[PDB]
Write a protein that binds this ligand. Structure first.
Ligand SMILES: C=C1/C(=C\C=C2/CCC[C@]3(C)C(C4(CCCC(C)(C)O)CC4)=CC[C@@H]23)C[C@@H](O)C[C@@H]1O
Lengths: 9, 237
C-alpha cells in the first residue's frame, strides 16, 4: 500500500 | 455532565471534520467532469478525493496516530466506503433525494450513480440509509463521533491490536452516550438508533464490494478508477 502509507506519513 | 477529557475529544473531532470537509465544494471543479458508464470518471474522482479527506480526519482522531501503520491501514481500507457514506449525509437533501454539492453539475441524483456501475439493488438501501440518517437530525458533535466510532471498529479484517482499538472505540462511545444524554433533548433512544446505523453501514459496505468487484474486474472500467481508489478498495494485504 504505497499511497496509503505515504498519506499516513 | 461531561468531563474535560470527553469535551476535548469532542473539540478534536469537530475540528478534524472541519479541516477535512469543505462546504464550498470548490475543489470539485478539478475532478473529471460529470457526463449524463459516463459518470464513473467524475464519481471515481469524487470518491478518491474523499478517501484523502477521510485519511486526514483519521490522523487527527485521538490515538489513531499511535496505532501501528499496519492497523491504521486495515481500519481505513475496511471503513473508507462507510465513512464516505456517512459524511455524504451532509450534502444529501431530503427534498430532491440526492446529494447536492453546490451547483447543479455536482448534484448527483440516483440516475447519475447508475451511470457509474451501480444497480438500484445497491442504491435503494443507500438512499434509504441516507434518509433515515437525515431524519435522526444529528448534532455535528454526534455526526463526527459516529464517523470516529465507525473508523475505530476493531471488528475489521486485518486488525492486530484488537484490545487497543476496542478501548479507543469504547471511550468514544462513552463520550457519545454522555453527549446525547446531557446535551441532546429528546435523545432517549438516539444512541441505539446510531448503533443500528453502524450495522446498516456493514450491509452497505458488502453490497458496494459486490458492485465494485465487477468494476475492478473489467479493465475498460477499472482503468477509469484512480490509483488511490484501486489500492484502498483492493484486496492486497
Ligand atoms: C463522497 C462524498 C459525497 C457524496 C457521496 C456519494 C454520492 C454519489 C454516490 C456515492 C459516491 C457512492 C457510491 C458510488 C461509488 C463508486 C465507486 C467507488 C467507483 O464504486 C456507492 C454508490 C457512495 C457514496 C456516494 C459528496 C460530499 O458529501 C463529500 C463526500 O465525501
Amino acid at each position: 500500500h504505497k499511497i496509503l502509507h505515504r498519506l499516513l506519513q | 455532565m461531561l468531563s474535560d477529557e470527553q469535551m476535548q475529544i469532542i473539540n478534536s473531532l469537530v475540528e478534524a471534520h472541519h479541516k477535512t470537509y469543505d462546504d464550498s465544494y470548490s475543489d470539485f471543479v478539478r475532478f473529471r467532469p460529470p457526463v449524463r458508464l459516463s459518470m464513473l470518471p467524475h464519481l471515481a474522482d469524487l470518491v478518491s478525493y474523499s478517501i484523502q479527506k477521510v485519511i486526514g480526519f483519521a490522523k487527527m482522531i485521538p490515538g489513531f496516530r499511535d496505532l501501528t501503520a499496519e492497523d491504521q491501514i486495515a481500519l481505513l481500507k475496511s471503513s473508507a466506503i462507510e465513512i464516505i457514506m456517512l459524511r455524504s449525509n451532509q450534502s444529501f437533501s431530503l427534498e430532491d433525494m440526492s446529494w447536492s454539492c453546490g451547483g447543479p453539475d455536482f448534484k448527483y441524483c440516483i440516475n447519475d450513480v447508475t451511470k457509474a456501475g451501480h444497480t438500484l439493488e445497491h442504491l435503494e438501501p443507500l438512499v434509504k440509509f441516507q434518509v433515515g440518517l437525515k431524519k435522526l437530525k444529528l448534532h455535528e458533535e454526534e455526526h463526527v463521533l459516529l464517523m470516529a466510532i465507525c473508523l475505530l471498529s476493531p471488528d475489521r479484517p486485518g486488525v492486530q491490536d484488537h484490545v487497543r482499538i476496542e478501548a479507543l472505540q469504547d471511550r468514544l462511545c462513552d463520550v457519545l452516550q454522555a453527549y446525547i444524554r446531557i446535551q441532546h433533548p429528546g435523545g432517549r433512544l438516539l444512541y441505539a438508533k446510531m448503533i443500528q446505523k453502524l450495522a446498516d453501514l456493514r450491509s452497505l459496505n458488502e453490497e458496494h464490494s459486490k458492485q465494485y468487484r465487477s468494476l475492478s474486474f473489467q479493465p475498460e472500467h477499472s482503468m477509469q478508477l484512480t490509483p488511490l481508489v484501486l489500492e484502498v478498495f483492493g484486496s492486497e494485504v
